[PDB]
RNA sequence: AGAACCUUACCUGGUCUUGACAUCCACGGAAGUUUUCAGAGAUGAGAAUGUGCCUUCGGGAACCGUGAGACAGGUGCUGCAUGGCUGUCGUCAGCUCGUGUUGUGAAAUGUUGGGUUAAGUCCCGCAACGAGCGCAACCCUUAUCCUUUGUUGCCAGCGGUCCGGCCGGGAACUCAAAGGAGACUGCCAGUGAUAAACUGGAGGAAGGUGGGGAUGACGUCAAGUCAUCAUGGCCCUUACGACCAGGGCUACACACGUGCUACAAUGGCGCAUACAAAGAGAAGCGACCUCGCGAGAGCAAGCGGACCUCAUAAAGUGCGUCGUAGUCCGGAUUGGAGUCUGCAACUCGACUCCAUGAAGUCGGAAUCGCUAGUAAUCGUGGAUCAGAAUGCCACGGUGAAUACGU
């Protein structure tokens, strides 16, 4: 819409990709996250948590 | 009042004021009155014979200050008296306007 | 990016006929609200959009106050003047903060605020358009039927409502039906329906007659009054200044065709058309149609009229459930009492006897002289006390001394009656005597006087036990009032 | 908006009829194509060769022949049975309606008058107040300017020049094609009833609707067309329908209508040379070179088009020259030799060469056109068209006189 098109001005993104949805995970189990591994194929920019 | 000089061309701008002006001085003072009148207070019934006879075709009660050269037959409530001078109108109109004012209560 | 802001403002301005300024003010408020939600603390935020570039700056602001209660939104005058010496109490200090990235979240908020402003201004335009048509018959299509109202579509995004009270009792509308009704109210409410339409009120009848009778639209015939029982029966009163036109005949039309068209639009409502008269009694006779009136007695003081009818016409004059008398009373503005000729005579004889008994009792006159006063039209002690002396002197056998004595007796009888009621309750006598004791309200004085305690002496003679049953009087308050009364009566 | 045949509806004569042409049904034959022909041709007698698709192969579609018919056909009569279309009063300013109003009424009033105008065009007055068809304005073309684009259009300043805008190159210019600016009594003065408006002036490319055009109010002639076509009747249907060859529409004591060419010296002939616009073009326009005195022919660029071609404009001018004559005026008519179109030029084409040389020497009664880039005069293009203009429709060159006035 005109308001979604206005993202080009301040944010800069052309059309925010094409659609919008964040890979969310399913249910059935609780837990406590004890250990996180991040492996990076060489050449790719490491983000701040890596 | 809002336009007719900037909405369109200047040729029709000056012209449509004349359509307003010629309609104002002859009709404009009756504009906000809907329906047939109820009493015509007339200043002269002689040269305005077409005025007094137009109400009798509609049964409106007429009031007219007539002179000796006028015709009393047309008007119902005939008021005799001089009405040609300017001084007589000062006594006439100011008095009869108050009679409608006491009726507006 | 830049030119895209201008293209969006131009597209929205042209499509919604809305001021660009109002859209920007709302986008600024939307972005300020979206910014406030990204901070954990309650901050105040101003956003300013540049009208040429579409670029926007975000400012956190603090209100300059004397005492700071909210450190997240308020700053002391001393601290504000450290940044700008020109600032006063009530001004704002502004810090430029990082403008929120225009993600699909801000985009959705901006869309919602635009849609809200578009609706607010579409609504203002609808109110301004329909304000000139207040009092007129509008035609709508039924969009939705609820239990309590009907929503009409008028076109051009204008919605009207008919309330349940504004409908006829037997009407059943379906979505897609066409409905006519009078626009009787335009409300500039920020939420809800703005246009209120009626089919039940008298204005619907008046405007249907204006459309169906050209002589009413041309102001040749005037509707003076309308009384209505919606979907059952109505009465209209018509006048004309043109003696060549029958106003009733014009409203009925050829074989009733005009009145039947109006009746059909109102679901078969029966319409009586009556001639307006400037004489109230003649107008009420006309309003009572189709019942024949035998006599009318007018009570100007009570604004009531007693209507005598023949015993055969009584049921017609009252009508089904009193509908005819009620519609005539609403049309005339008078309270109308319908009775038989025999009942009216019996009522007048009972009133005359009650007036004679009152005059004999209070004026110390004989029954023969009291009868003469009633035959001359005097019914009350007030009339005899206050009427001009000339009218009393027109009565055969009254001289100026006897009229003066009669007026003095009438005034004294009125004073006696007033004093009696003022001592029976708490109007004046007990509102001064019994209420002398400090603490006596007017209600308590009337409660005391209802027990026969009318004076401050009567209260001084009471025990606490004699007053214990008076609602709102405690034994302590009773004891205090009796002692106050005794202090004034016995020790003053 | 163009009759040699065709056209063509007419005449002489040769032929044919459910047919020149259409829908429907029956059976055969594909259709098609080539050839010999009877005869003036039509039509008819034939003779070869081919015999394609769908396959419901016991039949449809495409198409020819034969037969029966119901019909088809008619430029045959009625324009006063009519539609459509069109002419004219006249691009004159007029023709009416609604409601109110006056009169018994038919009707009148409005639209009448004082002014003014191209104009019931506006203005004022008015028992009338508004509305509609017209007038005007809106549309097209031309009148100057700015902006966009720059080819096949153009050449100012810029280099090479077979010195041709031909070639680099340039974007202002002419020109081109789109959109706007602009002229509206807008400004001034006098006049005029402080009206409308008129007569001058200013600025302006243009000034009083700038010029031209389209546009044609109710109705009038019971105008014209039945032959464009459509169509009620009426009538023919071995016919007034149909097919072919040839003729006629062009014939000729005579009168009128409309033009062309002239009667000459601001004129004719010869030589040299200047200046257009617009339009047309594919079984069509035709360079160039070449044979040809000429009309044209041969080979053949380019161009289904701002480029190529028709297409090298005429008076004008400069000069020579004739010398008021029926003559270097005029050229009708007539004989001979040819050019192309087309099956065909005799009745009955245009054109060309050589020869020929008429009437006519500015026109009586009477009558017509035209008020400006008009009259007059000159040359060009186009539709029609195989071919066939002096006509009609368009274009531009040159360029007047007079309008006291009713």
- Residue among C139, C192, C199 at smallest CA distance from C172: C199
Q: How many Cα atoms sit within 13 Å of B68 on the Cβ side?
A: 1
- For residues C74 and C62, the answer to whether their CB atoms sit within 8 Å is yes
- For residues C325 and C305, the answer to whether their CB atoms sit within 8 Å is no
Q: How many Cα atoms sit within 13 Å of C103 on the Cβ side?
A: 8
C168 three-class SS: coil
- For residues C153 and C176, the answer to whether their CB atoms sit within 8 Å is no
Q: What does the DSSP assignment read for B16-67?
A: HHHHHHHHHTTTTTTSS--S--S-EEES-SSTTHHHHHHHHTTT--EEEEE-
Q: Output the CA torsion C248→C254→C258→C260 (10° steps).
A: 100
Burial of C90 (0-12, 13-18, 19+ CB in 10 A): exposed
What single DSSP character describes residue C321? G
Distance CA(C136)–CA(C141), nearest Å, equals 17
What single DSSP character describes residue C166? G
CB under 8 Å to C28, separation ≥6 — which residues?
C46, C47, C48, C49, C56
- For residues A11 and C55, the answer to whether their CB atoms sit within 8 Å is no
Closest Cα of chain C to A12: distance in Å?
A: 8
| Residue C233 φ then ψ, to 5° | -155, 145
- Residue among C302, C304, C301 at smallest CA distance from C281: C304
- For residue C60, give the H/E element and its range: strand C56-65
Angle at C442 (CA atoms; ends C440, C445), nearest 5 degrees = 60
CB B22 within 7 Å, strand D = yes
- Residue among C369, C360, C316, C365 at smallest CA distance from C338: C316
| Residue C91 φ then ψ, to 5° | -75, 175
Distance CA(C315)–CA(C324), nearest Å, equals 10
How big is chain B, counted in residues? 105
Q: Strand pairing partners for C97?
A: C58
- For residues C122 and C157, the answer to whether their CB atoms sit within 8 Å is yes
Q: What is the resolution of this structure in A?
A: 4.5
Q: What does the DSSP assignment read for C331-360?
A: HHSSEEEEEEHHHHHHHHHHHHHHHHHHHH
CB B54 within 7 Å, strand D = yes
CB B18 within 7 Å, strand D = yes
Burial of B61 (0-12, 13-18, 19+ CB in 10 A): middle
**Radius of gyration over every alpha carbon of chain A, rounded to an integer in angstroms:** 18
Contact with chain C for residue A17, Cβ under 8 A = no
Nucleotides of D under 7 A from a protein CB: 100-102, 123-124, 127, 130, 184, 186
CA torsion sign for C363, C368, C371, C375 is: negative
Can you give the distance from the CA of residue C337 to the C1' of nucleotide D208 in angstroms? 84
- Residue among C297, C237, C321 at smallest CA distance from C271: C237
Distance CA(B105)–CA(B103), nearest Å, equals 6
C430 three-class SS: coil
Q: Is B34 left (phi over 0), alpha (psi -120 to 50) or beta?
A: beta
Please tell me which chains touch B, using 3 or more CB pairs under 8 Å as the contact test. C
Distance CA(C478)–CA(C90), nearest Å, equals 58
Distance CA(B47)–CA(B64), nearest Å, equals 12
Instruction: Count chain B–chain C contacts defined by CB atoms under 8 A.
Output: 17
Q: How far apart are the first and last CA of chain A?
A: 37
- Residue among C121, C158, C109 at smallest CA distance from C12: C121
What single DSSP character describes residue C165? G
Distance CA(C205)–CA(C473), nearest Å, equals 58
C170-175 LR contacts (CB < 8 Å, sep 24+): C170/C231, C170/C267, C171/C199, C171/C231, C171/C267, C173/C142, C173/C145, C174/C142, C174/C145, C175/C142, C175/C143, C175/C144, C175/C145
Angle at C248 (CA atoms; ends C253, C337), nearest 5 degrees = 135
- May I ask the CATH architecture of the domain B1-27? Orthogonal Bundle (1.10)
**Radius of gyration over every alpha carbon of chain C, rounded to an integer in angstroms:** 38
- Residue among C62, C54, C60 at smallest CA distance from C32: C60
Interchain proximity C2–A9, CB inside 8 Å: yes
CB under 8 Å to A31, separation ≥6 — which residues?
none
How big is chain A, counted in residues? 50
Strands (E), C86-134: 92-97
Distance CA(C225)–CA(C217), nearest Å, equals 16
Burial of C343 (0-12, 13-18, 19+ CB in 10 A): middle
Count each helix (H run) and each strand (E run) in chain B, helices first: 3, 3
Resolved by: cryo-EM
- Residue among C323, C262, C269 at smallest CA distance from C291: C323
How many CB atoms are closer than 10 A to CB C384?
22
- For residues C73 and C42, the answer to whether their CB atoms sit within 8 Å is yes
- Residue among C48, C38, C50, C30 at smallest CA distance from C111: C30
Interchain proximity C104–A9, CB inside 8 Å: no
- For residues C448 and C430, the answer to whether their CB atoms sit within 8 Å is yes
Helices of type H across C86-189:
104-130
Helices of type H across C181-319:
202-212, 214-217, 247-252, 257-265, 280-287, 314-318
Distance CA(C188)–CA(C196), nearest Å, equals 11
| Residue C484 φ then ψ, to 5° | -65, -45
Distance CA(C429)–CA(C455), nearest Å, equals 8
């Amino acid at each position: 819409t005109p308001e979604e098109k206005l993202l080009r001005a301040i944010f800069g993104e052309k059309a925010s990709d094409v659609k919008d949805s964040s890979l969310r995970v399913p249910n059935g189990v609780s837990g406590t996250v004890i250990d996180v591994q991040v492996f990076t194929r060489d050449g790719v920019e490491k983000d701040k948590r890596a | 009042q809002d336009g007719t000089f900037d909405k369109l061309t200047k040729k029709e701008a000056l012209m449509r004021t004349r359509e307003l002006e010629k309609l104002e001085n002859s009709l404009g003072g009756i504009k906000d009155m809907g329906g047939l009148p109820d009493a015509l207070f007339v200043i002269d019934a002689d040269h305005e014979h077409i005025a007094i006879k137009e109400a009798n075709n509609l049964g409106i009660p007429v009031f007219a200050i007539v002179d000796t050269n006028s015709d009393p037959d047309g008007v119902d409530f005939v008021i005799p008296g001089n009405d040609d001078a300017i001084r007589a109108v000062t006594l006439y109109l100011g008095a009869v306007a108050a009679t409608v004012r006491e009726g507006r209560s | 990016m830049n030119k895209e802001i201008l293209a969006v403002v131009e597209a929205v301005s042209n499509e919604k006929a809305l001021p660009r300024e109002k859209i920007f003010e709302a986008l600024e408020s939307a972005l300020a609200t979206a910014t406030k939600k990204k901070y954990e603390q309650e901050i105040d935020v101003r956003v300013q959009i540049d009208r040429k570039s579409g670029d926007f700056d975000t400012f956190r602001r603090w209100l300059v106050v004397d005492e700071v209660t909210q450190p997240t939104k308020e700053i002391t005058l001393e601290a504000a003047r450290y940044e700008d010496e020109s600032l006063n109490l009530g001004d704002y200090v502004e810090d430029q903060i990082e403008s929120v990235t225009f993600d699909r979240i801000t985009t959705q908020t901006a869309k919602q605020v635009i849609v809200q402003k578009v609706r607010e201004a579409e609504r203002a335009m609808v109110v301004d358009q329909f304000r000139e048509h207040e009092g007129e018959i509008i035609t709508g299509v039924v969009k939705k039927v609820n239990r309590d109202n009907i929503s009409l579509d008028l076109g051009n995004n204008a919605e009207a409502v008919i309330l349940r009270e504004d409908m006829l009792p037997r009407e059943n509308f379906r979505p897609g039906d066409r409905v006519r009704g009078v626009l009787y109210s335009v409300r500039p409410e920020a939420r809800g329906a703005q246009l209120f339409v009626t089919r039940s009120k008298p204005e619907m009848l008046i405007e249907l007659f204006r459309i169906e009778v050209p002589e009413i639209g041309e102001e040749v015939i005037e509707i003076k009054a309308a009384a209505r029982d919606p979907g059952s029966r109505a009465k209209i009163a018509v006048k004309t200044n043109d003696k060549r036109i029958d106003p009733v005949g014009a409203c009925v039309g050829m074989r009733g065709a005009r009145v039947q068209a109006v009746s059909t639009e109102l679901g078969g409502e029966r319409i009586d058309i009556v001639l307006w008269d400037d004489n109230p009694a003649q107008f009420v006779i006309n309003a009572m149609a189709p019942a024949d009136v035998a006599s009318i007695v007018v009570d100007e003081d009570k604004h009531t009229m007693d209507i005598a009818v023949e015993a055969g016409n009584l049921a017609q004059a009252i009508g089904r459930n009193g509908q005819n008398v009620r519609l005539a009373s609403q049309l005339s503005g008078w309270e109308l009492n319908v009775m038989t000729v025999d009942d009216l005579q019996a009522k007048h004889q009972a009133e005359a006897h009650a007036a004679i008994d009152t005059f004999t009792k209070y004026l110390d006159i004989d029954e023969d002289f009291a009868t003469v006063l009633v035959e001359e039209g005097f019914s009350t002690l007030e009339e005899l006390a206050y009427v001009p002396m000339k009218e009393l002197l027109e009565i055969e056998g009254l001289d100026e001394p006897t009229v003066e004595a009669l007026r003095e007796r009438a005034k004294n009888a009125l004073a006696t009656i007033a004093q009696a009621q003022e001592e029976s309750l708490g109007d004046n006598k007990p509102a001064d005597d019994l209420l002398n004791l400090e603490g006596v309200d007017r209600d308590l004085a009337f409660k005391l006087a209802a027990r026969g305690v009318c004076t401050l002496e009567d209260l001084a003679e009471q025990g606490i036990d004699d007053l214990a049953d008076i609602e709102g009087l405690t034994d302590e308050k009773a004891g205090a009032l009796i002692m106050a009364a005794r202090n004034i009566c016995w020790f003053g």
